[PDB]
Design a protein around this nucleic acid. Structure first.
Ligand code: MG
Ligand code: MG
Ligand code: MG
Ligand code: MG
Ligand code: MG
Length: 738
RNA sequence: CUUGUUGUAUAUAUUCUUUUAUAGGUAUUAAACAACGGAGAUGAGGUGCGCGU
DNA sequence: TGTCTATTTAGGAGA
DNA sequence: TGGTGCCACGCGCACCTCATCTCCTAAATAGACA
């Protein structure tokens, strides 16, 4: 397979930001024409024009006037059945004969072949291929009543196939049995899905054809592929260029055709391609025609590609370990009791408990929970509530955060003194990660505050909704992103997130090398794909407490609102500024309510900024060269199933039916599972079981294929609670709860 | 050219920064450890703010 | 009369 | 479900994560300049 190496240009280069901007504008004009004619023009018309004017007996004109494509619209060139080069040539020479992109050359006089046809136009065509070949549909949900039109119900069945992935009839049968068979079902939700399931069977193929028709019909409203204003990149493909080792140096030289002559661009050396290594030999003998110019941080970089041989190892199944990912007490918990057998490993929870100062702050049960976690093999102590004590100064966890931080930094300095580099790097990165997330949160909140200030200041008066044109033009003419305030905040946020990513990579590398050193052949992980959880608790804001809640002119003495609104009013969250007649004119977030809003934002943003569903990607990248491999398992009911029986907990019903027990019934406390273990130790030991048992490995995990770059040795196709729950029942992996 | 990017110092000084404050900016001192397939686009989501309901 | 660099073209069913 | 601990509709303007796909070629000829 082909890899990449970046190089930094050492001197001055003709490639400036203006050249790249001109390239980008040419991209935009070409894509604008393509989007304006994606269905209006036919392939046969373009081919006929070329044959009549230029008059060539070439294959790209013969295939365009063939009967397969003579009548079809322009977007069929981007489908995977049409010949790639033939479609490129037909489109390019039609646009060129017509001058449809307004091309008048370029500033550096770069060879028009290497700049226009095989540069921006080639990227445009390759982008429009991705759009067409993965064409989707956009349907807005709607509640269907008992007496509703056929068109409304027909659309909603297509909607449910799009979102919930209901292809086969078994997909519907599992989904209904997942929704139905649970304590306290929602009758309204089941009625809609049953109606749509009935409709799906009667028009199943018509649904699959109307989906395609609607996708093609929506392509008219497509805005086209647009090269963003923040790109600062340019790709040229040149068949004949040269890369030579610079004599008496560790650098390289790029000989490039620039305005009918040869230009030389000097490149800094790269430790990925060193003089005595085999990677320099592979790079220098197998590089490709791809050349990238990118301006990152006001500096020019050059990218290339080259071939390489991958010797990634196969799975072994001799010693496996699971791993759950959490946020409340530990970042990573394995499925292995710590018994002073792993080498290079240090227990930070078994370090915290050795100090009397920390345990004295612990209540009797909390102390037992920490002593519970300290026997497992854990990593990177993250404390969601203790960390928020840094921002919320009037908190109840403040003294615990101070002691935790002090002990952690003392351990860091001690490890630095004793020359234990891997452990020292790990501890320092844990400290820095905890510190940097708070900075990220502060910067995000400031961004929100400044945006609100700017919007209220502008005072956008718009005539009507439902259309952008009716609204004030200033709302599009002067958006908040343009002002200088927004740019500094985003720069600071990007820097903080970069630090976070680096620290996380260091921690994961530590974990992987610990597992690799002792002879663990496979590491199993959850298949995490979403981390954008909804903000499940947002207090009714000032606008929403007076408009949607209709509390604007009600009575404080007699509040005609919801029970939850009564709960909120009873506590001091709000400041109702009533008038002389006890009519509310304004409402203000008090200190308690504002702090609650900040807390909700803090925990919601923690899921994303720490890249919850991307640590398996780091483990895969480390598994590309290492001896330990990676297995991805479905992340359903792993923190809801017994690790000592490998069974689910299902209770009876009022009708005597076995249904699914609530997730909060097998989980009394968030740290304990009813089986008498730690839930993270339970969840990680569930994860290991799929790999451990040959039966479950074949049932849930895909067959081991050839080793590939960024590919787990074991992966999963099934995605969804209904899919996993259905398979769990069929193998009798179920026990009856009390 | 003892050479690229990113992470790692609770390191020295600062009438620096609450818009990174157990951290950064600005200017120094030091050491190794590690990872590195790049570009663009499209799509699905979540979240912020304003105008309406 | 070379001597380098830009620039077309690349299939398919049909036979 | 997973992470926590359970949550309003339209129009827009912006920022983030995560998934997926394209693409990384070679020969032969035409032209620019002496
Ligand atoms: Mg988990
Ligand atoms: Mg940094
Ligand atoms: Mg867990
Ligand atoms: Mg660097
Ligand atoms: Mg470095």
């Amino acid at each position: 397979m082909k890899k990449s190496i970046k190089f930094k240009v050492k001197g001055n280069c003709p490639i400036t930001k203006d050249v790249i901007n001109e390239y980008k504008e040419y991209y935009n004009k070409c894509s604008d024409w393509i989007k304006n004619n994606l269905t209006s023009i036919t392939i046969g018309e373009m081919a006929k024009f070329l044959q009549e004017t230029l008059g060539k007996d070439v294959a790209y004109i013969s295939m365009g006037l063939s009967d397969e494509w003579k009548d079809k619209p322009l977007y069929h060139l981007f489908t995977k059945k049409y010949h790639t080069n033939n479609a490129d040539n037909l489109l390019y020479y039609y646009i060129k004969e017509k001058n449809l992109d307004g091309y008048k050359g370029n500033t550096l006089n770069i060879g028009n072949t290497f700049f226009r046809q095989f540069g921006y136009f080639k990227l445009v065509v390759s982008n429009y291929r991705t759009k067409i070949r993965t064409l989707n549909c956009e349907i807005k949900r709607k509640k269907i009543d008992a007496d509703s039109t056929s068109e409304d119900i027909e659309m909603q069945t297509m909607y449910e196939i799009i979102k919930h992935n209901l292809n086969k009839k078994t997909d519907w049968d599992e989904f209904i049995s997942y929704i139905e068979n649970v304590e306290n079902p929602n009758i309204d939700n089941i009625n809609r899905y049953k109606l749509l399931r009935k409709c799906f069977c009667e028009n199943e193929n018509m649904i699959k054809n109307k989906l395609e028709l609607l996708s093609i019909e929506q392509l008219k409203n497509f805005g086209g592929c647009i090269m963003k204003q923040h790109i600062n990149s340019m790709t040229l493909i040149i068949q004949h260029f040269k890369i030579e080792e610079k004599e008496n140096s560790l650098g390289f030289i790029l000989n490039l055709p620039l305005n009918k002559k040869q230009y030389q661009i000097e490149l800094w050396g790269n430790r990925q391609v060193n003089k005595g290594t085999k990677e320099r030999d592979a790079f220098l003998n197998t590089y490709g025609e791809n050349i990238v110019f990118i301006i990152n941080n006001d500096e020019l970089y050059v990218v290339f590609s080259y071939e390489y041989e991958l010797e990634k190892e196969e799975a072994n199944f001799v010693k496996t370990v699971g791993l759950d990912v959490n946020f409340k007490h530990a970042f990573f918990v394995t499925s292995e009791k710590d018994n002073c057998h792993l080498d290079g490993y240090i227990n930070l929870y078994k370090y915290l408990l050795e100090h009397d100062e920390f345990t004295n702050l612990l209540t009797n049960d909390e102390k037992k929970d920490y002593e519970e976690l300290s026997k497992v093999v854990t990593f990177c102590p993250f404390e969601n509530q203790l960390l928020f004590a840094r921002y919320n100064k009037m908190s109840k966890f403040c003294k615990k955060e101070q002691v935790l931080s002090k002990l952690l930094y003392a351990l860091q300095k001690q490890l630095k003194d004793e020359n234990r580099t891997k452990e020292y790097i790990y501890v320092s990165c844990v400290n820095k990660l905890r510190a940097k997330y708070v900075s990220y949160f502060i910067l995000k909140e400031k961004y929100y505050e400044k945006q609100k200030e700017y919007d209220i200041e502008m005072g956008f008066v718009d005539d009507s909704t439902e259309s952008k044109e009716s609204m004030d033009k200033r709302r599009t003419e002067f958006p908040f992103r343009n002002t200088p305030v927004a740019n500094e905040l985003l720069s600071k946020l990007n820097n903080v997130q970069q630090d976070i990513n680096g620290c996380l990579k260091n921690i994961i590398n530590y974990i992987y090398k610990i597992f690799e050193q002792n002879g663990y052949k496979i590491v199993a992980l959850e298949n995490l794909e979403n981390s954008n959880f909804e903000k499940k608790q947002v207090l009714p804001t000032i606008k929403s407490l007076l408009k949607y809640h209709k509390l604007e002119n009600q009575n404080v003495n007699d509040i005609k609102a919801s029970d939850k609104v009564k709960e909120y009013i009873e506590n001091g969250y709000y400041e109702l500024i009533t008038n002389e007649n006890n009519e509310i004119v304004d409402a203000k977030y008090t200190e308690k309510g504002a702090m609650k809003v900040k807390n909700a934002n803090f925990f919601n943003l923690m899921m994303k900024s720490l890249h919850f569903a991307s640590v398996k990607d780091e483990f895969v990248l480390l598994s590309n060269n290492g001896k330990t491999q990676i297995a991805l398992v479905p992340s359903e009911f792993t923190s809801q199933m017994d690790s000592t029986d490998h069974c689910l907990y299902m209770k009876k019903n009022d009708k005597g039916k076995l249904v699914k027990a609530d997730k909060k019934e097998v989980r009394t406390k968030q740290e304990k599972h009813i089986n008498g273990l730690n839930a993270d130790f339970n969840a990680a030991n569930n994860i290991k079981y799929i790999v451990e048992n040959e039966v479950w490995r074949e049932i849930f995990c895909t067959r081991p294929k050839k080793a590939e770059y960024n590919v787990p040795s074991l992966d999963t196709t099934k995605k969804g609670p209904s899919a996993i729950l259905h398979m769990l029942k069929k193998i009798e992996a179920i026990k009856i709860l009390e």
